[PDB]
Amino acid sequence: NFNGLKGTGVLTESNKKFLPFQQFGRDIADTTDAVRDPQTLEILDITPC
């Protein structure tokens, strides 16, 4: 869960650079594929295991 966004998957450090105002990354299916951790401002890709 990130900020209420429930899901299941494997988290890994992203090379994606979010701009200051983004919290979620979306794929072509509009599913959240990346997220900025709310305590430490670095980006995880979310992948189904």
Added chain:
Amino acid sequence: FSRLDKVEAEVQIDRLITGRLQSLQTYVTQQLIRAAEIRASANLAATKM
């Protein structure tokens, strides 16, 4: 599921399951119709061979 109960979530989910399932029966019908054209070609290619 992040926001509704096991009583109204279902009333929404039922429409995602219906739509996405119809999106499969449509894709499978398209593949079966195309498979029949590739077969006509494969039968001509075997006859050319």
